[PDB]
Amino acid sequence: VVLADFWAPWCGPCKMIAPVLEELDQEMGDKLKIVKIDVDENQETAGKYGVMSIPTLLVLKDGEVVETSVGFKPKEALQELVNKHL
Amino acid sequence: DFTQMFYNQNVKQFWLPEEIALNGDLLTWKYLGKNEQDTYMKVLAGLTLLDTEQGNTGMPIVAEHVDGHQRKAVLNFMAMMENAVHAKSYSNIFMTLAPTETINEVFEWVKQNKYLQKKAQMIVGLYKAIQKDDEISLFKAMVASVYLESFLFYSGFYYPLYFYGQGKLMQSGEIINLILRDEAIHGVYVGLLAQEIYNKQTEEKKAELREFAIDLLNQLYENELEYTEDLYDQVGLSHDVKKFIRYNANKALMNLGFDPYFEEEDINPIVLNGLTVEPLKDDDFYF
């Protein structure tokens, strides 16, 4: 189970989600991998996943996208989103 | 963001009835037909009766329930204009054009008139329904107030503006134009106070308030069409008056931050004729 964060350095909401993902890694990092990808440097992956703003959070399970969340989310909402797929 | 600006615009528009001499209107009044004189009298009485409700209830009730010293002051100023300036101005126009007995009869007729009463009582009903510390009921009353200021008056204003645009009854037309200019700013101001309440609501509550506003507009509009035919068919103007009502309904909606309801139409041209610095700190010239 992987939480992929599509972000950019200029994106205000993406700066707000960064500390939330660090807390989530401390609490769940034994069962959840967190991956960050910068869409300004990695346009091909952002295009492949048809991701249409930032932050976009993809929950992947064994390489397949099982859930998609757009915009800022608090920690508890990200935990609920990931715990469905653990 | 807006009350001090409206304060300024309101007080700089201050005027008094005595400033316009009315007697010279008798030189065009005498040349109108009976139907024209009848329609004018009835329209004038309609405006007078509605404006009295606004002076005695509409503005003072809103001033009472709105919080903020500066808003209460602006609202007080508007209430003053209704009672001290507008009401005296309408009376002056009447006393100039008709003898005492004719004035009393016209007011008796318009007081019993079904279409005038329907709209007058609908508006007054919403003012009477405001409850202390309930912003929803206040908003509904503000909508009613904006509809009166920016919409309901205009089936009436049409006729004086129509004459004014033709060079007839110029003194009373000048007075009406000053009154109308006050009601326009009153409508815009109360509209901003209503939007403030609207913007504090949830999305479901907003949709519900929009439905209220549109439903109310529809009821008033259908009665305006009947009111219009009742007064203006005898002088052949109803088609053009209806266009003017819809155009002003759209302005009232825009005052409440809502989209126009009616398609854009052209208006009678005679009535139209009547109407972050950040200083360069060096090291920015080097890259």
Partner: protein, 683 residues
């Protein structure tokens, strides 16, 4: 709601979390089938159509007479042999609303896209059937887009001029000011935008024939020109747009800038006059060193030296002006003036920042004149000479006023066809024809410069669209490499076609021998530096195309030295904001403002997704506001080194950035060699 608009409205209705971009093709199909075919008048044969259009004052009979009817018929057939289909609803809507010929009552459509293209091609060829078919193939493939005046008015009788822009030099006299107003109104009647150089006008409070402190400065002339453009506003089809350009060392620079302030009173405020500021490198040097600067009174300089202030080198003559007691001046703070410029651009988008020394350091025609100002779109940087209009019954000394014939290459379509050379050469020929057939009797200097300079503008567009549709980020170094290579090839083939035209006609542009083309200084960086792509991904784009090498540039330099150059100026990148829709291309070389443009035409909103926008290339179509403006400056400077004229460089800024960020972008553009800056758009 119309069916086509409702189908176009389905773009943003997301199913499965995806935009319905396939609905735009359905939208264009519905648009055609339900409106265009029904409202297009059809003739039994092309002969009837041409006869009806010529007889009803729709077409000129002169340009159609050089071809036999079989030639015109075959040109139309080869226009319809392509079977061109518009890719988006907005393309067809824009074409059939702005450019397609309609009847006198504007109720029926007389011209298809393939008929407009055929007529424009027949106008371009001027009696050559094969050349007309070549132009038809060029335009129906949408490799080259003639400017809006040219595309709209070629071969038409109810036409203005084919020139998109005019640049007037206003001399310091009442006769010259009145004639400038007259010419501005005449050229606005023709439909073209007019830019005026007010730097020669003497400052406010100057002397008029021993009568001191009598002038109103350039601001009175701005008011006159503003009312002239309002009066000659093309009857209301489109408001008369004019431009006023002033040097930053003019005394009236603050008064010139205050015209765009919102707080400015109506007695000093202009409304239809776009303002541009010409910034020499001396001003940037003074602002960098924080020394107090001086703006000068032009008439004092003229009296002392005999030349206008903008006619002399500011970097050399600034200290002489400051040390001259006879040259009146007032002290200003150059850094405060730069901050005022930044705040004005933030609040209104004005002025157009023109870096004079960035233009004249690589200007090929500095012997004719330095480039003292730009056009209304801040992309036409040409040498101009002021005209001394004398009294009545006195012969006027007619100078050179810039006339710019514009044309745009669709980079996507040019690159997909692997036809840089043929497209550039055919576009150069078409622009030469437009310049030749254009005469303007009421502007002696514009006409003289059109006949002598023969300057044309060959722009480019769909740069960002091509890059995003090829998986290249506009800010990426690969994008800059592609721009470098593509525009080097464009410059190579434009120069080659100009030299070939000069050889065929035996004549070069006036004063060519003193230009860097004749001396070979223009080709130094081309015979010294190789501009082939440095990235294998970019080099693969130019596969099947001969990239001009150093040896090829040496051969071209020798060819130009032997035969000359027909055009003084060839390349200039205009914004092309209107014809971009028809060609399904991004406007200019600028990055896209919005991925899906929201437009309201009537009571219905019409969404326009960017050309080729899809799910796989969503993040390659990065909006210009989210992009680093330094990277955009780098891109434009990479393009600008291969463009002899300017580029309409628009700055796309966020509301979070301050006036210091705007000044930093301006100074980075100046440092990177950017010639002009068009607009400061805030989101």
């Amino acid at each position: 709601v119309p069916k086509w608009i409702q189908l176009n409205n389905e773009i943003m209705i997301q199913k499965d979390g995806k935009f319905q971009f396939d609905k735009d093709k359905e939208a264009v199909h519905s648009y055609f089938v339900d409106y265009i075919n029904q409202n297009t008048v059809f003739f039994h044969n092309l002969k009837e159509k041409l006869d009806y259009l010529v007889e009803n004052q729709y077409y000129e009979e002169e340009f159609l007479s050089l071809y036999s009817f079989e030639d015109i018929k075959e040109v139309f057939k080869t226009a319809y042999a392509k079977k061109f289909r518009f890719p988006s609803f907005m393309s067809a809507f824009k074409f059939y609303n702005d450019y397609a010929l309609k009847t006198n009552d504007k109720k029926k459509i007389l011209e298809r896209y393939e008929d407009r293209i055929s007529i424009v091609a027949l106008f371009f060829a001027n009696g050559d059937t094969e050349k007309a078919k070549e132009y038809v193939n060029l335009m129906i493939n949408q490799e080259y887009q003639p400017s809006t005046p040219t595309f709209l008015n070629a071969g038409r009788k109810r036409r203005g001029e084919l020139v998109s822009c005019f640049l007037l030099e206003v001399n310091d006299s009442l006769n010259d000011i009145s004639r400038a107003i007259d010419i501005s109104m005449q050229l606005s009647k023709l439909g073209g935008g007019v830019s005026l150089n007010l730097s020669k006008l003497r400052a406010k409070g100057e002397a008029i024939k021993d009568v001191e402190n009598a002038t109103k400065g350039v601001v009175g002339v701005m008011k006159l020109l503003d009312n002239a453009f309002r009066y000659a506003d093309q009857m209301g089809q489109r408001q008369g747009s004019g431009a006023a350009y002033l040097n930053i060392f003019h005394r009236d620079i603050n008064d010139f800038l205050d015209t765009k302030k919102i707080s400015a009173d109506e007695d000093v405020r202009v409304k239809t006059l776009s303002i541009g500021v010409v910034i020499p490198d001396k001003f940037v040097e003074l602002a960098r060193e924080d020394k107090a600067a001086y703006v000068f009174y032009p008439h004092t300089i003229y009296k002392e030296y005999g030349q206008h202030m903008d006619e002399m080198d500011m970097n050399e003559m600034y200290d002489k002006f400051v040390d001259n007691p006879r040259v009146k001046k007032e002290k200003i703070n150059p850094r405060k003036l730069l901050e005022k410029l930044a705040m004005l651009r933030s609040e209104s988008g004005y002025p157009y920042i023109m870096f004079q020394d960035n233009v004249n350091k690589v200007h090929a025609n500095n012997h004719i004149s330095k480039v003292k100002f730009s056009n209304l779109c801040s992309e036409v940087l040409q040498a101009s000479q002021v005209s001394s209009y004398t009294d009545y019954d006195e012969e006027d000394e007619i100078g050179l006023d810039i006339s710019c014939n514009l044309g745009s290459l669709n980079i996507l379509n040019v690159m997909e066809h692997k036809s840089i050379e043929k497209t550039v050469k055919l576009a150069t020929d078409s622009l030469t024809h437009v310049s030749e057939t254009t005469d303007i009797r009421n502007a002696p200097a514009v006409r003289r410069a059109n006949k002598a300079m023969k300057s044309i503008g060959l722009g480019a567009m769909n740069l960002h669209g091509y890059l995003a549709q090829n998986g290249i980020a506009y800010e990426s170094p690969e994008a800059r490499d592609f721009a470098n290579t593509f525009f080097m090839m464009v410059n190579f083939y434009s120069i080659q076609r100009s030299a070939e035209i000069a050889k065929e006609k035996g004549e070069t542009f006036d004063q060519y021998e003193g230009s860097t083309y004749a001396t070979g200084e223009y080709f130094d960086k081309y015979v010294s530096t190789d501009f082939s792509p440095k990235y294998e991904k970019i080099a693969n784009l130019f596969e099947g195309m001969h990239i001009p090498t150093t040896e090829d540039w040496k051969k071209l330099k020798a060819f130009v030295a032997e035969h000359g150059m027909y055009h003084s100026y060839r390349l200039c990148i205009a914004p092309t904001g209107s014809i971009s829709y028809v060609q399904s291309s991004t406007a200019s070389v600028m990055p896209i403002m919005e991925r899906i443009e929201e437009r309201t035409y009537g009571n219905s909103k019409t969404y326009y997704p960017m050309p080729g926008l899809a799910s796989n290339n969503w993040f390659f179509y990065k909006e210009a506001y989210d992009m680093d403006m330094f990277k955009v400056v780098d891109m434009i400077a990479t393009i600008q080194q291969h463009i002899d004229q300017g580029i309409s460089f628009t700055l796309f800024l966020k509301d979070t950035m301050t006036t210091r960020d705007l000044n930093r972008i301006d100074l980075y553009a100046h440092h990177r060699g950017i010639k002009t800056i068009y607009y400061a758009r805030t989101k």
